[PDB]
Amino acid sequence: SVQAEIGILDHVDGSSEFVSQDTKVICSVTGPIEPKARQELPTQLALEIIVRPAKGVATTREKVLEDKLRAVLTPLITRHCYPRQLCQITCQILESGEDEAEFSLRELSCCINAAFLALVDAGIALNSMCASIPIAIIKDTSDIIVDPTAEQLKISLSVHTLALEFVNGGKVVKNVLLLDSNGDFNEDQLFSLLELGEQKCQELVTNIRRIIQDNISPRLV
Amino acid sequence: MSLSVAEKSYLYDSLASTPSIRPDGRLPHQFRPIEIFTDFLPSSNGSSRIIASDGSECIVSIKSKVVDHHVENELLQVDVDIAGQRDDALVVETITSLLNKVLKSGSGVDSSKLQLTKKYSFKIFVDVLVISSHSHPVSLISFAIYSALNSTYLPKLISVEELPTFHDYDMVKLDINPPLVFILAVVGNNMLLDPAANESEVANNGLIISWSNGKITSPIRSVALNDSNVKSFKPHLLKQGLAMVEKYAPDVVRSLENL
Amino acid sequence: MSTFIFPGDSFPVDPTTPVKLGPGIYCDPNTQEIRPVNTGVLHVSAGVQTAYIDYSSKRYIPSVNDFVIGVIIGTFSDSYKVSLQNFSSSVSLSYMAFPNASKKNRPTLQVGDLVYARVCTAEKELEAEIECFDSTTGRDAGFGILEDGMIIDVNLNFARQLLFNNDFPLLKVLAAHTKFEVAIGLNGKIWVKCEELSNTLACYRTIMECCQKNDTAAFKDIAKRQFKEILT
Amino acid sequence: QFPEIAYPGKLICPQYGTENKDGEDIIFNYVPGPGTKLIQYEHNGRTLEAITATLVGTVRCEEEVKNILVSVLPGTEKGRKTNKYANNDFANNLPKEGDIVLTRVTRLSLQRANVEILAVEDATFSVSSDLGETFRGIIRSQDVRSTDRDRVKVIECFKPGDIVRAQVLSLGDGTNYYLTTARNDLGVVFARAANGAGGLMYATDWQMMTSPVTGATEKRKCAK
Amino acid sequence: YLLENFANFKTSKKYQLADWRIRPLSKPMTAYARADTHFLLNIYDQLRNKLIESNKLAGVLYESRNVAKRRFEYSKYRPLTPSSEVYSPIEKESPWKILMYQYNIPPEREVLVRELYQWRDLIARRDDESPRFVMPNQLLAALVAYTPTDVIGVVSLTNGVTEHVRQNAKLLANLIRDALRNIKNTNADGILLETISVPQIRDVMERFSVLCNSNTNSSILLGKILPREEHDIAYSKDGLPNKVKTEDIRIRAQNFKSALANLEDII
Amino acid sequence: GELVTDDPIWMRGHGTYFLDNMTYSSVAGTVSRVNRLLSVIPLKGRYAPETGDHVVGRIAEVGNKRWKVDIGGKQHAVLMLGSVNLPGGILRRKSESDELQMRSFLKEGDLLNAEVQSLFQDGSASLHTRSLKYGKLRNGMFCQVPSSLIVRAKNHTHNLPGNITVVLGVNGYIWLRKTSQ
Amino acid sequence: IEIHPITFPPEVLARISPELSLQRHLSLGIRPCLRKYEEFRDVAIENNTLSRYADAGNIDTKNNILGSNVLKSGKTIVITSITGGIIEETSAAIKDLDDFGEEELFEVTKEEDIIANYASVYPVVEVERGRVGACTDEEMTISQKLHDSILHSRILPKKALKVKAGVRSANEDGTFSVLYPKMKRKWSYVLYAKIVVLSRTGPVFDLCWNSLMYALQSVKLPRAFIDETYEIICDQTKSVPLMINAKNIAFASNYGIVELDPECQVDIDMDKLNTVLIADLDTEAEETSIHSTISILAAPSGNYKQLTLVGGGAKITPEMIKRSLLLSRVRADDLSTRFN
Amino acid sequence: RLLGPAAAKPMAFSNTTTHSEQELSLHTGFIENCNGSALVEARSLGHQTSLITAVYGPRSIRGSFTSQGTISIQLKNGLLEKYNTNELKEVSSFLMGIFNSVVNLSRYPKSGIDIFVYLTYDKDLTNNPSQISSLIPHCITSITLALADAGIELVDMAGAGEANGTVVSFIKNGEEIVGFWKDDGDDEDLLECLDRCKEQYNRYRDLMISCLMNQ
RNA sequence: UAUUAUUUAUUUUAAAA
């Protein structure tokens, strides 16, 4: 079970807050707004992805976290219907929920889920839906576990971040947005967790669809 | 100010003539009037302020530190700070790298005159503050570090190896031969000494020459004075400029060591 | 027929019947399929059958034939520079877009002035243009400078419900307490003004509180409690 | 008699040269060209106005007591056919007045269309990433068409990302060039539907462009 | 601006270019005329107090005296130097020069716009009319661009001619025809060869010939790793690499360029 | 900060500000009284341009339909395009913009002389070169003196012995050149 | 109806539209790099070329590099050297308290931390692209990826970077003599790497990793000793090679998934889905157009260390995932044995 | 990560633990990013030098109205024998004063030329203990090669040589000097310095044309 | 061509009829 809220921040177009285990990420989206000269795109929408750590300043660790979060949201946004415009997606990691010096998958997974919900609250044209879960395998008993705790990461052989794309009521997996894997694994373990992850993300969007509908429906008429 | 291309060609033809028609009309070996103040920073071991004719001003401060020369390489460090420029600017790092070569410990400055025990010696910190500058100030700064090093007082040493101790009131005078740097501007076939602002803008090339112990010493450079009219020079001009400073440098040292 | 929809879902309209594209649905220039891109309630009207999605949004996108409240941020030789919303792209307001305009006469509008205009050009690849008199119908009543008063920030759905739907009881519950004059802009701006400032202040606090409380039946108790508080 | 290959610094010939041919003495007038410069040299105390090559390639002479256009083209004759100097040729060959270029619309204003020059004539052309070498021009609304120049709509003639074949007019304001498309062979030569989000459209009428697969039509200022 | 703000007088401002010669004035024009000075005294009281608080009263009174000191003078007797204290209906030595740039007129037709601008001015003085009444600049540009030869061409122009042009069609046609026939009426190397001549070229060439009589390691550390050319490989089914030859990619290059430009018909 | 007078019947000038029906000074200088104009003349001050000044200025930049000339005041003076003697009389358009065509004969850094035609509200000077007397300076050398040390006279430029001509600009800019025709 | 297009030479084609020039080449089964679908680039390396221990006989005195590698794949050039330092570690263990109660409480409450027993290198990437300024986003992302992959792949265990501390003596007129083996003070080796990428034509992370894996297999740890205020000193010539387990070493290779369009070489062929797979991406045309790539770190024995799967462009099917993994093995098996 | 642990110290090697001809190799044209490339290598006595030079130009500067071009030379450390950043920029300003007198600047209006020199390897094999003077002649020859490969007009070739810290760059077969650099050294000596550098200049002046005319 | 102009505007005299 995961917790999520929508429309929490005032001075932005769309905000969200995603919680999983102990990882908490607050994300905000503002767009379309006037882009900078070094940002504008002649035909499509420009994105400004910013993730900030819970402790210390933004290091190069969050730079690759931006680049991965960017690769997920870019195909998820209908950029072409916002020419010469800007969208500011800012993720604030409140609690890491994991050892920052060793792992960064539980924060990447939450930033994806927080950014998607914030993009829904903002009103940006999205081509589809998205879900992200962290996956790990334990050393002694090579068992695949979904959404592992912080202690299970320190006893894992490999860690995985699976980001999927859902269409048509959240049942058809259109594509695999991101599958980031690090550790020790072979071809048999990949498709074993990939098949296991496709049904855990499938119930995440089913729960995410319920979360955003419980909030947007009272707003509209 | 800047110069128009009309008056640029007017100065080039008048300076490159066999009778060098200087703007102010001085001789190719005459300098401009200079004002030099000394001994005004009590917190520093030595200090000096120099004011050029074109409003250029430079302030030098000299601090000291007891350091072990067996582990401290350079005993003389120069830290330049030009007003209105960043500390990582090219115009600052070049002069900083050049002034640490004219004042290198063991080269232009003999490390023996600032030594203490067999283990310890003094490290001189020469800090430069250029308030105003119109041309290349490497020659104006060299005059300021000259008058400051010739008025610097370091604490007197009181003397099994133990840490050194110094007297409470009495201090010794720093007697070091401070090198001097001159700027030469070649305009066609004429060699000019101490070029002005507008003079250094039409010059074909420039020359930097050091002077210590009553003779020409390292380092010497041939950096340009303006990227517009950069012209290669005949080696006889290099010899003429290198020999012209030998003829008038003692006149400077005599007029500069009076304090 | 109204149902909640999500991006990427199947569009519940057969491709046989021609359907008009509205705000919310998107026609892929490649696959030519009609798919949603926003999240909200889907609306389909049973001559012409149009379809659109009502999604929650606060960042205004310029669209033609829209009444907006803009702020003048720049005076120039032949046009003003107007901002419809902070951080957004500015729009153009020509000097000839006024009643009784003249090339030899500059309008008496300065920066910081609120104008009630109509969007007459909303090209995606160009700067949007506004005008203080309808170039199609010749209207001019209600357009122009909004002197004094107070402007309020609301979401786009609250502003559209207040201008179009006559059943929205906010205007009615406000008239029961004080006489005022209101100007509603589709860019999320609401300009109110009363005789006394105390009445305008209570109108500001009510519209602010009614925008966040989506319970339409609570608007009567909001204005009742708000106007009763300023009397202290 | 000059060596074919030349290096920057090789003395070619002075500005004056004579020879006796058929009992009629002629004097050659050698003027500097693209790849040379008059350099004074001293060997006995007297100067001379000699021509010195300053490029890496072959020397070529042309004509306009006649004058001789002494120039040095960069590269070898075998390298020019392979076109191994495509990046160097783009920067060294600046777009002069009256040239034809292939640009890309990047910004649409109500009265102009900012473009980015990508090629230029040398049909052969010349085109160069992190190279940092690119030119840009402006196609004003008055230079879009010849029929009814004033009072046009550039939104119906160009779109951001379209490739435009336009002839230059003159250096606009130093920052930008001034181009024109008031010809039947000048205009959009390669565009895509919905600002590149659709299919490859093809020109049909003088102001109509359509894609075969999608079948969607969009108005442009085509060239055919 | 002073009425709508300091006087709170909202007014439509269109009775400026109207014909004020008509009598009696209409009720809107009488109300507009009185409004230009009715509130100007109250505005004067407000602006004066603000100039005292801002210490700008001295500059306004100084500029006001310079406005009252303006002197009207005929254009023929105007000063040659531009001054802000003297006024003339024409303040330029050649007023037709700014018309040739405004309407893009070739400089060869300046003799035409000169004789037409001067003729238009003398006609305006005779009938006490404005130069634009007898011939606007829009029609003046058409006469110099189209150059109507026959008398019919002077009358039939796209914009339409004025009555002065209609009556003087024969005179104007005789002027453009005469000015155009006056346009058709209007429409080295031995300097340096004598200084050096020919026999003295053998000296500068002999100077050349004997002035310029004064004119391989494979690698050390990185010379045999960096200048290496491209080598492309392909893994077979057994996992072994197979280097393709530089002639195989040559076949691919000439096969693409030849098959690229070979498209001249699409169904 | 100090009080100069408490008489409300005065016209405040430079170095002077009004406050509470009383008059105070904003600079440090001598009090001046001319008719009813009360002002304070500060010690050090830049050149204050006025209408009709034979000045010498240097071109800073070529702007939109004007030039920025360095006169030596608080701001750059503006030299409009329709205020100089153009080469071919008018612009030869269309081809290039107005700004690019100006750099062909009047680039940045060029030195010239002109007359202050009028003043802007902020005090900026508006120059003009509408006579043969004003033009582009050459055949000489430039020097600069303080503007206050320029004695007023009928003639701005004078002929000097030795075939030399001086151009005493009232703004402090002087141009010493050989006497021309 | 029927309208013929506009002809363009291949030079201006790649400039006006990289996506068009990409599809046109793929119609002939080729790429703009003049290579087929699954054709890679040959590599040439030179190990210990810049190292202090290049010549076993003439070991350099004033050198610092513990091991280097100069790689070149296609036209990109990668230069990777490995310097090093040493750090003194303090014993902050509860064992030194000599208390059974506190030690038992530590053993019960201590949680397992598998990756805590491994260290990593601190790389510095410098991709020369003719620009000035601070570190590019590319240089920073590559440095972080090399650090995170070296640490997770377990290349450098912490016990493999320990310092067998020595004590050099001052025997009579033998000037000095060093002896080697529990000692009090402890030390650990710290490895620094600097990478300089020249003539970049595409994604160079795979080239930086493969160049670092070669340089790591050629570094020697200089033996350290203390005199008899006494800092540690490394030996002038004697050294021990870094014991890197060849089981965990892996190599990099990037693959892309491109969907073919019918508009680039009549209505039945329009609905003909055929997504192709490209190996070792290069050139600006393939880097920008292809939005669905696969980068894999494959170790011998069919073991994979790292893999990123971005599906932005065409849909990635499990068939192409199996194909990329198998195609990753045939290159890791080559790069690991093509020189040694 | 980067930089690493702050408590770590760099390795220290002790000197008491165990104990005519100047080779040259030239190449050009091998960097696809830039226009002109160069690679010079020299190994004499116990000092080996190998550096790489790239030329990115001419680049049209937006909004610029300069009459002639602007040259930008930047030295950058490599992997061995790291010099201080102040002295590197000092040699850069000295080099820019040289090529501004050689490169045809009037042939590039409103544009600039950026030079990048990478001191990738400066080996030194002295037995037992300014060192930058031995690299200035090798850097001048590398830039002239990459400038010639980039199709940039250079008025005559430019080379230099070292004579005990004295670096002199000649032009026109040694007829005129374009640069002068001298660190440390002795006194009175000058005629032999200009002679030893001039013969070393002619050795580099023709060897650069060798690799430039082949390939 | 300042009653001229700058378009995401560097104009800093738009006032009179």
Residue C125 Cα, gap to closest chain D Cα (Å): 6
CA distance C102 to E15: 11
CA distance F168 to F146: 11
CATH of the domain at C127: 2.40.50.140
The candidate with the shortest Cα–Cα distance to D91, out of D124, D121, D134, is D134
- In chain C, how many domains are there? 3
If you count DSSP H runs as helices and E runs as strands, how many of each does chain F have, helices first? 1, 15
> Is the link from the previous residue into B178 a cis peptide, with omega within 30 of 0?
no
> b or e along E43-75 (b: 16 or more beta carbons within 10 Å of the residue's beta carbon)?
eeeeeeeebeeebebbeeeeeeeeeeeeeeeee
H29 Ramachandran zone, left/alpha/beta (phi>0; psi -120 to 50) = left
In strand I, the nucleotides that come within 7 Å of a protein beta carbon are 1-17
- Taking the C1' atom of every nucleotide in all shown strands and the CA of F79, the nearest one is I2
- Report which secondary-structure segment, H or E, holds F132: none
The alpha carbon dihedral of F104, F106, F111, F113 has a sign of positive
CA distance D53 to D71: 8
Q: How crowded is residue G200: how many other Cβ atoms within 10 Å of its Cβ?
A: 21
- Report which secondary-structure segment, H or E, holds H82: none
Q: How far is the CA of C92 from the C1' of I8 (A)?
A: 9
Residue entry with tokens 């008063």: C149
Beta strands G251-259 and G293-299: pairing type? antiparallel
The helix, strand and coil proportions of chain F, stated in percent and rounded to the nearest 5, come to 5, 45, 50
Beta strands A85-95 and A23-33: pairing type? antiparallel
Which phi and psi (to 5°) does residue E232 adopt? -105, 140
| Domains (range + CATH), chain F | 1-47 (2.40.50.100), 48-181 (no CATH)
Q: Residue C53 belongs to what domain range?
A: 1-57
Identify whether the C-beta of residue E142 lies closer than 8 Å to the C-beta of residue E158. Answer: yes
Query: Which two tokens mark F23?
Result: 């008059």
CATH of the domain at C224: 3.30.1370.10
Assign G322 to helix, strand or coil: helix
The candidate with the shortest Cα–Cα distance to D72, out of D37, D96, D122, is D37
Q: Which of C96, C108, C111 would you mutate first to test chain E, the one with the most E CBs within 10 A?
A: C108
Q: Residue H31 belongs to what domain range?
A: 1-215
- Report which secondary-structure segment, H or E, holds F119: strand F111-119
Query: Which two tokens mark D84?
Result: 């191994």
Residue entry with tokens 């002073």: E2
- Report which secondary-structure segment, H or E, holds D93: none
Instruction: Report CA dihedral (C22, C27, C32, C34) to the nearest 10 degrees.
Output: -70
Q: Which of D16, D31, D43 would you mutate first to test chain E, the one with the most E CBs within 10 A?
A: D16
Query: Which two tokens mark G145?
Result: 């990826």
Max CA separation in chain A (angstroms): 55
Same domain, C62 and C38: no
- Taking the C1' atom of every nucleotide in all shown strands and the CA of D173, the nearest one is I6
The candidate with the shortest Cα–Cα distance to A128, out of A187, A169, A80, A69, is A169
Same domain, C143 and C64: yes
Query: Which two tokens mark B115?
Result: 């030594």
> b or e along H106-141 (b: 16 or more beta carbons within 10 Å of the residue's beta carbon)?
ebbbbbbbbbbbbbbbbbbeeeeebebbbbbbbbbb
CA distance D144 to D162: 15
Same domain, C82 and C141: yes
C165 Ramachandran zone, left/alpha/beta (phi>0; psi -120 to 50) = beta
Where are chain D's structural domains?
1-75, 90-224
Identify whether the C-beta of residue D166 lies closer than 8 Å to the C-beta of residue D139. Answer: yes
CA distance H100 to H89: 16
| Domains (range + CATH), chain G | 1-340 (3.30.230.70)
What method was applied to determine this entry? X-ray
Outline where chain A has alpha helix (H).
60-73, 105-122, 150-153, 168-171, 187-219
Identify whether the C-beta of residue D12 lies closer than 8 Å to the C-beta of residue D51. Answer: yes
| Domains (range + CATH), chain B | 1-259 (3.30.230.70)
Beta strands F54-63 and F37-42: pairing type? unpaired
D and E: number of Cβ contacts within 8 A: 38
Q: Do F109 and B23 touch (CB under 8 A)?
A: no
CA distance F26 to F10: 16
Q: What string of H, E and C letters represents the secondary structure of C26-54? A: EECCCCCCEEECCCEEEEECCCCCEEEEE
CA distance H14 to H19: 10
Instruction: Report CA dihedral (C211, C213, C218, C223) to the nearest 10 degrees.
Output: -50
Q: How far is the CA of C134 from the C1' of I14 (A)?
A: 26
Cβ contacts (< 8 Å) between E203 and chain D: which residues? none
Residue entry with tokens 């004789």: E115
Identify whether the C-beta of residue F113 lies closer than 8 Å to the C-beta of residue F56. Answer: yes
Assign B139 to helix, strand or coil: helix
Report how far Cα D48 is from the mean position of its chain's Cα atoms. Answer: 35
CATH, range D90-224:
2.40.50.140
Same domain, C106 and C131: yes
CATH of the domain at H59: 3.30.230.70
Residues 84-123 of F with CB under 8 A from B: 107-111
Q: Which of G113, G148, G325 sits opposite A182 (nearest CB)?
A: G148
**Cα angle vertex B75, ends B74, B78, to 5°?**
80
CA distance C98 to C135: 10
The residue type at F68:
K
Query: Can you say which residues of E are annotated as belonging to the binding site for UMP?
Result: 13, 16
Q: How far is CA H62 from CA C14, G72, H67, H71, in A?
A: 54, 36, 14, 16
Domain boundary among C148, C172, C198: C148
- Taking the C1' atom of every nucleotide in all shown strands and the CA of E2, the nearest one is I15
Q: How crowded is residue C218: how many other Cβ atoms within 10 Å of its Cβ?
A: 12
CA distance C145 to B28: 73
The candidate with the shortest Cα–Cα distance to G306, out of G245, G243, G253, is G253
Query: Which two tokens mark H145?
Result: 């090669």
- Taking the C1' atom of every nucleotide in all shown strands and the CA of E15, the nearest one is I17
Residue E186: exposure state from Cβ atoms within 10 A (0-12, 13-18, ≥19): exposed
Q: What does this entry list as its resolution, in Å?
A: 3.1
Q: Does G147 touch chain H (CB under 8 A)?
A: yes
Q: Which of A38, A39, A43 would you mutate first to test chain D, the one with the most D CBs within 10 A?
A: A43
Beta strands B76-82 and B120-132: pairing type? parallel
Identify whether the C-beta of residue A30 lies closer than 8 Å to the C-beta of residue A122. Answer: yes
If you count DSSP H runs as helices and E runs as strands, how many of each does chain B have, helices first? 4, 11
State the Rg of chain B over Cα.
20
Residues 6+ apart with CB under 8 A from C222: C173, C206, C209, C210, C213
CA distance G161 to G153: 16
The helix, strand and coil proportions of chain A, stated in percent and rounded to the nearest 5, come to 35, 35, 30
Residues 6+ apart with CB under 8 A from C58: A13, A14, A122, A123, C155, C156, C188
Residue F107 Cα, gap to closest chain E Cα (Å): 23
Q: Do F117 and E97 touch (CB under 8 A)?
A: no
CA distance C53 to A220: 11
The candidate with the shortest Cα–Cα distance to H176, out of B231, B223, B229, is B231
Identify whether the C-beta of residue F165 lies closer than 8 Å to the C-beta of residue F178. Answer: yes
The alpha carbon dihedral of F16, F18, F24, F26 has a sign of negative
Beta strands A45-52 and A85-95: pairing type? parallel
CATH, range A1-221:
3.30.230.70
Whether chain A lies against chain B with 3 or more Cβ pairs closer than 8 A is no
- In chain H, how many domains are there? 1
Q: How far is the CA of E162 from the C1' of I17 (A)?
A: 24
CA distance E254 to G246: 45
Architecture in CATH of D1-75: Beta Barrel (2.40)
Assign B255 to helix, strand or coil: helix
**Cα angle vertex G143, ends G138, G149, to 5°?**
120
The candidate with the shortest Cα–Cα distance to B176, out of B247, B108, B255, B79, is B108
Residue entry with tokens 């000692």: G183
